[PDB]
């Protein structure tokens, strides 16, 4: 049985983009693999988080992991900062990666561009992510398309460690879904939907109510051609909405194109809103159950004990390979 | 009673420069303050260390700390990597410091210049050093002159944390000795003596034997004026040797100038070598005692337990201020 690791930042409430690109597949993969799923709060603070909001986003993400169907007896669910080994291995991998490699990362370039001063944590985001992955001898990392480059750097860091010091790490491999690997923003269809977007109209969160979802879909930007057909270059907004519709309803894109012949954007968007609402309905109900209870903390307690045992042993091996300590 | 923290890298065997600028003063300060003295092996690997050499340099530095008179009942002696809180607080402070501040650090600029690829750990050396200091509510940091800028950044990071999140850190202050704060290299008197110099002639280590010390002092570069007098700009080599002589023998510089009127560089250097040798003689004897015994490990074991208790509590407060975890 191979091992899976994946994380999500408590930098906000997860979006349908996070759901379609990652979390939805976690729920199937837990039955086929040894799975670790992580709330990566040390990654979240690489940009400013208000402390009260961050504490609460951590609880909410834990509740949403379990609400969408992750079974804490089939997968290990835990908070990054409660496992000190992650920071320990991240320091060691920071001494392996070169500065030039971190500066050419697309996400660092995008998230720092135009900013006068950004934190060192933003630059050193990959070594901590590589630590999360590599500590558990991970084979498969399910992520959306935007993380492919980070996984490629992780493979490089693991090879480098293994060849500079001796074979220790499994070389992980990304698993990127064929559909929905990059949901686009509702207000700018040339950039991806991000849960930290300063514009709330850009994303649907899993906790948005019905009136909010209706507003956000009906104001999603589209062209003026008036024809519901998939075409990424010429109709990027409608294409994105057809992708969300298709993957949540199970109807193919061409089935939806046929379903909306001679139909206007207005009835298409009204319908899509109800597809998303009906999708989120059972999720939000299990979410409220987990938020109201102390069972949520026991799951995370148990998860951190299990993760600590595995990770702190791999840290011992890393230190012995590098010659640290005794 | 105020608190002292200082560290030394196991990147090599400590030099008379490390002794004169720092370690020698640790031995007096342990009786006046609550003292933490650290073997900072996570800092050492920011550049390449051979694992076997690093393991052994860690033991040797512990032995030399105790050999020069640090009492493990008056000071806490421990290895950085055995206290996970250091890496944990270093990550948090990496999210506080800005990249621009790390790039303007003199040591980073000096240690990376001319190198094609350096590690991210070299750049993020200060946040880990600021973590070491700040975790113990340190008041005073005894260091040589070359660390003044790092302490200034540490004060900035502490103020920033305190004002962004609430008062938590003591603002530390450097204590730089008036004499011997910057021993110069024996082969290039315009740069400081460094224990990682690729040229062993540049430094005297505390473990150098008599014939080695004699060779290194007699080949120390000097001018050709032939006059033993202190003048930093025109006679930087002889000035440095007069500084080492003065501070190890207790004779003032002008006393030594009078002592060597009409004397040549050859008798001056021969004499200085024996001053250094006689200085190192009792140190090397206590060093060999500590290396041959398991008592060295018990000291470090006890030190790490004491440091962990203090540091892991400050990490809890840091996490609660930033909103990490629960
Ligand atoms: N538009 C998106 N479409 C599909 N998957 C996504 C999308 N955005 C993020 N992901 C995936 O969701 C997972 C979690 O990523 P993350 O926690 O960074 O969400 P995010 O929306 O990008 O938040 P942030 O803006 O703070 O980075 C990753 O595997 C990531 O590739
Ligand atoms: N020439 C020097 N003169 C006086 N003090 C020094 C000198 N070099 C280092 N120090 C002091 O010794 C202490 C320990 O520093 P460190 O462990 O980095 O030694 P180092 O010789 O600089 O080794 P490296 O070359 O690996 O950096 C610091 O307080 C530092 O300021
Ligand atoms: C959530 C972030 C990260 C934390 N450590 C891991 C481990 C696996 C996948 C990811 C991550 S995905 C990445 C991202 O920025 O998308
Ligand atoms: C030894 C290094 C470092 C590790 N953490 C600390 C704490 C205090 C003083 C120093 C240090 S001095 C610094 C240096 O590079 O000189
Ligand atoms: K946020
Ligand atoms: K919002
Ligand atoms: K599109
Ligand atoms: K070395
Ligand atoms: K040497
Ligand atoms: K000089
Ligand atoms: Mg992201
Ligand atoms: Mg140094």
Can you characterise this structure?
Chain A is 53% helix and 7% strand. Chain A is mainly alpha-helical and 326 residues long. Chain A folds into two domains: 1-182 and 294-326, no CATH class; 183-293, no CATH class. In chain A, helix 4 crosses helix 8 (125-134) and helix 8 (125-134) crosses helix 9. The radius of gyration of chain A is 21 Å and the shape is globular. Chain A starts with a strand and ends with a helix. One copy of the ligand C[C@H]1c2c[nH]c3cccc(c23)S[C@H]1C(=O)O binds at residues 5-9, 40, 43, 129, 132-133, 141, 143, 147 of chain B. One potassium ion (K) binds at residues 184, 189, 232, 236, 239-240 of chain A. Chains A, B: Catalyzes the attachment of tryptophan to tRNA(Trp). Chains A, B: This is Tryptophan--tRNA ligase. Chains A, B: Homodimer.
What labels would you give this structure?
14 helices; mainly alpha; 3-stranded parallel β-sheet; 326 residues; binds the ligand C[C@H]1c2c[nH]c3cccc(c23)S[C@H]1C(=O)O; binds potassium ion; 5 strands; binds magnesium ion; two-stranded parallel ribbon; homodimer; globular; binds adenosine-5'-triphosphate; 2 domains
């Amino acid at each position: 049985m191979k091992t899976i690791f994946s994380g999500i930042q408590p930098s906000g409430v997860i979006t349908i983009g996070n759901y379609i690109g990652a979390l939805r597949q976690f729920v199937e993969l837990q039955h086929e693999y040894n799975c670790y799923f992580c709330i990566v709060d040390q990654h979240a603070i690489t940009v400013w988080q208000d402390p009260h909001e961050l504490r609460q986003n951590i609880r909410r993400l834990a509740a949403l992991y379990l609400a969408v169907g992750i079974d804490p007896t089939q997968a290990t669910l835990f908070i990054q900062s409660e496992v000190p080994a992650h920071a320990q291995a991240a320091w060691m991998l920071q001494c392996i990666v070169y500065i030039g490699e971190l500066e050419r990362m697309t996400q660092f370039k995008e998230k720092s561009a135009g900013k006068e001063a950004v934190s060192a944590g933003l630059l050193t985001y990959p070594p901590l992510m590589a630590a999360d992955i590599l500590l558990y001898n991970t084979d498969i990392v399910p992520v959306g398309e935007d993380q492919k480059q980070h996984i490629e750097l992780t493979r490089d860091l693991a090879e480098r460690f293994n060849k500079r010091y001796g074979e220790l790490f499994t070389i992980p491999e990304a698993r990127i879904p064929k559909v929905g690997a990059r949901i686009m923003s509702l207000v700018d269809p040339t950039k991806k939907m991000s849960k930290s977007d300063p514009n709330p109209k850009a994303y649907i969160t899993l906790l948005d109510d019905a009136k909010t979802i209706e507003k956000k879909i009906k104001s999603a930007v589209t062209d003026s051609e008036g024809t519901i057909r998939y075409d990424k270059e010429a109709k990027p907004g409608i294409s994105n909405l057809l992708n969300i519709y298709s993957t949540l309803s199970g109807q193919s894109i061409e089935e939806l194109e046929r379903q909306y012949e001679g139909k206007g954007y207005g009835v298409f968007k009204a319908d899509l809103a109800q597809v998303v609402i009906e999708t989120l309905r059972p999720i939000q109900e299990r979410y409220h159950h987990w938020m109201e209870s102390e069972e949520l903390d026991r799951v995370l307690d148990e998860g951190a004990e299990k993760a600590n045992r595995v990770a702190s042993e791999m840290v011992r091996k890393m230190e012995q390979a590098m010659g640290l300590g005794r």
